[PDB]
Scaffold this active site. Structure first.
Site, PDB file in Angstrom:
ATOM      1  N   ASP A 180       0.821  -1.213   0.000  1.00  0.00           N
ATOM      2  CA  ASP A 180       0.000   0.000   0.000  1.00  0.00           C
ATOM      3  C   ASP A 180       0.853   1.260   0.000  1.00  0.00           C
ATOM      4  O   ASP A 180       0.463   2.277  -0.579  1.00  0.00           O
ATOM      5  CB  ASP A 180      -0.891   0.038   1.250  1.00  0.00           C
ATOM      6  CG  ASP A 180      -2.226  -0.688   1.059  1.00  0.00           C
ATOM      7  OD1 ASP A 180      -2.619  -0.977  -0.109  1.00  0.00           O
ATOM      8  OD2 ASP A 180      -2.894  -0.935   2.101  1.00  0.00           O
ATOM      9  N   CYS A 214      -0.995   0.950 -14.136  1.00  0.00           N
ATOM     10  CA  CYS A 214      -1.233   0.995 -12.703  1.00  0.00           C
ATOM     11  C   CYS A 214      -2.356   2.021 -12.548  1.00  0.00           C
ATOM     12  O   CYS A 214      -3.380   1.891 -13.221  1.00  0.00           O
ATOM     13  CB  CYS A 214       0.095   1.317 -11.940  1.00  0.00           C
ATOM     14  SG  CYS A 214       1.195   2.704 -12.703  1.00  0.00           S
ATOM     15  N   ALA A 216      -1.797   5.821 -12.631  1.00  0.00           N
ATOM     16  CA  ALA A 216      -1.419   6.849 -13.614  1.00  0.00           C
ATOM     17  C   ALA A 216      -0.638   6.298 -14.805  1.00  0.00           C
ATOM     18  O   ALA A 216      -0.445   7.049 -15.799  1.00  0.00           O
ATOM     19  CB  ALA A 216      -0.569   7.929 -12.939  1.00  0.00           C
ATOM     20  N   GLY A 217      -0.093   5.080 -14.728  1.00  0.00           N
ATOM     21  CA  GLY A 217       0.680   4.547 -15.834  1.00  0.00           C
ATOM     22  C   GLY A 217       2.091   5.079 -15.928  1.00  0.00           C
ATOM     23  O   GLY A 217       2.675   5.075 -17.026  1.00  0.00           O
ATOM     24  N   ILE A 218       2.665   5.528 -14.817  1.00  0.00           N
ATOM     25  CA  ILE A 218       4.029   6.073 -14.796  1.00  0.00           C
ATOM     26  C   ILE A 218       4.932   5.520 -13.692  1.00  0.00           C
ATOM     27  O   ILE A 218       6.138   5.426 -13.904  1.00  0.00           O
ATOM     28  CB  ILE A 218       4.071   7.623 -14.847  1.00  0.00           C
ATOM     29  CG1 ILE A 218       3.415   8.194 -13.583  1.00  0.00           C
ATOM     30  CG2 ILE A 218       3.446   8.119 -16.147  1.00  0.00           C
ATOM     31  CD1 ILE A 218       3.605   9.744 -13.496  1.00  0.00           C
ATOM     32  N   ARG A 220       4.611   2.553 -10.799  1.00  0.00           N
ATOM     33  CA  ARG A 220       4.828   1.113 -10.816  1.00  0.00           C
ATOM     34  C   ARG A 220       4.972   0.614 -12.232  1.00  0.00           C
ATOM     35  O   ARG A 220       5.806  -0.242 -12.515  1.00  0.00           O
ATOM     36  CB  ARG A 220       3.665   0.373 -10.151  1.00  0.00           C
ATOM     37  CG  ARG A 220       3.529   0.666  -8.681  1.00  0.00           C
ATOM     38  CD  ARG A 220       2.274  -0.035  -8.176  1.00  0.00           C
ATOM     39  NE  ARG A 220       1.977   0.484  -6.863  1.00  0.00           N
ATOM     40  CZ  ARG A 220       0.897   0.129  -6.201  1.00  0.00           C
ATOM     41  NH1 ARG A 220       0.097  -0.829  -6.678  1.00  0.00           N
ATOM     42  NH2 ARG A 220       0.613   0.742  -5.042  1.00  0.00           N
ATOM     43  N   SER A 221       4.195   1.181 -13.165  1.00  0.00           N
ATOM     44  CA  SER A 221       4.314   0.773 -14.563  1.00  0.00           C
ATOM     45  C   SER A 221       5.700   1.103 -15.097  1.00  0.00           C
ATOM     46  O   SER A 221       6.269   0.344 -15.878  1.00  0.00           O
ATOM     47  CB  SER A 221       3.316   1.582 -15.405  1.00  0.00           C
ATOM     48  OG  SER A 221       2.002   1.061 -15.191  1.00  0.00           O
ATOM     49  N   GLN A 261       8.265   7.449 -10.158  1.00  0.00           N
ATOM     50  CA  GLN A 261       7.732   8.623  -9.489  1.00  0.00           C
ATOM     51  C   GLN A 261       8.387   8.946  -8.157  1.00  0.00           C
ATOM     52  O   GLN A 261       8.111  10.018  -7.616  1.00  0.00           O
ATOM     53  CB  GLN A 261       6.225   8.517  -9.334  1.00  0.00           C
ATOM     54  CG  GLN A 261       5.558   8.943 -10.629  1.00  0.00           C
ATOM     55  CD  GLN A 261       5.568  10.461 -10.785  1.00  0.00           C
ATOM     56  OE1 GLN A 261       4.795  11.150 -10.097  1.00  0.00           O
ATOM     57  NE2 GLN A 261       6.452  11.006 -11.676  1.00  0.00           N
TER      58      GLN A 261
HETATM   59 CL    CL Z   1       8.810  13.195 -12.600  1.00  0.00          CL
END
Ligand code: CL
Ligand code: CL
Ligand code: CL
Ligand code: CL
Length: 280
Positions: A180, A214, A216-218, A220-221, A261
Site C-alpha cells: 500500500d 497501474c 497513472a501509468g508512470i 509502478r508501470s 515517481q
Molecule cells: Cl517526474
C-alpha cells in the site's frame, strides 16, 4: 558493477539526488491533444498526459484520444504501451486499443482499490457468466478462466470484435501484492511475476506491444518497463555491465513523462535489475 554502483549510492545516501537529476534532465515534449477541452474526462490525472509524438491513436472516427503512450525501446528490441488505469468511461477505449494494437497481454500492477481509494475501473469481468459489452467500441469481453496465485493472478480473457465476430485470447497478468505504501522490501515476487509474463509468450514480437498500467501509468508501470528493458539489454549487450539504468530511464522518458515517481522506486528498480540479472 551495477551492484558496486548500488552499494555506493546506498552508502552515500544519494538516491534522492540521483532521482532529482533524472527529473531535471527528462525530455519535455508537447501534449496538445491530451489537453484539448474535449479530452478532459479521458484523463485520470490532469498532471499525467501522453506526449503527442508517442500517444496511441484510436482508429474509430469521432475522437482518437486515449491516455496511453508507445514506449519503443529500440536497442532492447521491445515496445510497451503504458497507460493509466481505465476510467468508467474509457474501458471501451482501452479494449479498442488492445484490439487495434494487437496486444496479447495486459500487465496490471495495482489492486482496483488500495487504502480505500479507487485506482482504476473494474474493466474486466470477474464472473464467467457476466461478460462485459462495450457498446461504444462494439467489443465483448468474457472471463474464460483464471489462475489465482499467492502474489499474482493470470486470467484468460476472450475479447471479441462484435463487428467481425473475430475473437482473440488476451492474458491478464495482475500483480496483486505491491505494498500500500512504498516499494516491496524484496524484488523476488516482482521478478517472478516479470518472468511469468515473459514465459507466457505475451512479449513475443509476433504480437503487438504489451499493455501496462497501474493508476497513472508512470510509477509502478515505469518500474516494470524499466526492469524488463534493462534485463533485456543485459542479455544482448556484449558487456552486460555497460547497462546504465539512469540512461535507460531517460530514454524511456522520451516516450512518456514521469516514469518512476519516487527515489524509492528508482532504488527498487536497481535492486530488481541486479537480482534479476543474477537469475539469468
Ligand atoms: Cl517526474
Ligand atoms: Cl476541444
Ligand atoms: Cl483488484
Ligand atoms: Cl546504457
Amino acid at each position: 558493477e551495477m551492484e558496486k554502483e548500488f552499494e555506493q549510492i546506498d552508502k552515500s545516501g544519494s538516491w534522492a539526488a540521483i532521482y532529482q537529476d533524472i527529473r531535471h534532465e527528462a525530455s519535455d515534449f508537447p501534449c496538445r491533444v491530451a489537453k484539448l477541452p474535449k479530452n478532459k474526462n479521458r484523463n485520470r490525472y490532469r498532471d499525467v498526459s501522453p506526449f503527442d509524438h508517442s500517444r496511441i491513436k484510436l482508429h474509430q472516427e469521432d475522437n482518437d484520444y486515449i491516455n496511453a503512450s508507445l514506449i519503443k525501446m529500440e536497442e532492447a528490441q521491445r515496445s510497451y504501451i503504458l497507460t493509466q488505469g481505465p476510467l468508467p468511461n474509457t474501458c471501451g477505449h482501452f479494449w479498442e486499443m488492445v484490439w487495434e494494437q494487437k496486444s496479447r497481454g495486459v500487465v496490471m500492477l495495482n489492486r482496483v482499490m488500495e487504502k480505500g481509494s479507487l485506482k482504476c475501473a473494474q474493466y474486466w469481468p470477474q464472473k464467467e457468466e457476466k461478460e462485459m459489452i462495450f457498446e461504444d467500441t462494439n467489443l465483448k469481453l468474457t472471463l474464460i478462466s483464471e489462475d489465482i496465485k499467492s502474489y499474482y493472478t493470470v486470467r484468460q480473457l476472450e475479447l471479441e470484435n462484435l463487428t467481425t465476430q473475430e475473437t482473440r485470447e488476451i492474458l491478464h497478468f495482475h500483480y496483486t501484492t505491491w505494498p500500500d505504501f512504498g516499494v516491496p522490501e524484496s524484488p523476488a515476487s516482482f521478478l517472478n511475476f516479470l518472468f511469468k509474463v515473459r514465459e507466457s509468450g505475451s512479449l513475443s514480437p509476433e504480437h503487438g506491444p504489451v499493455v501496462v498500467h497501474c493508476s497513472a501509468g508512470i510509477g509502478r508501470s515505469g518500474t516494470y518497463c524499466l526492469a524488463d528493458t534493462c534485463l533485456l539489454l543485459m542479455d544482448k549487450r556484449k558487456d552486460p555491465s555497460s547497462v546504465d539504468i539512469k540512461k535507460v530511464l531517460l530514454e524511456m522518458r522520451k516516450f512518456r513523462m514521469g516514469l518512476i515517481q519516487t527515489a524509492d522506486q528508482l532504488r527498487f528498480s536497481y535492486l530488481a535489475v541486479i537480482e534479476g540479472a543474477k537469475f539469468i
